[PDB]
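Entry 0007
Protein: PawL-Derived Peptide PLP-46
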Amino acid sequence: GYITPLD
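Output (structure tokens):
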């Protein structure tokens, strides 16, 4: 959700 869409 921050560094990568997955997070």
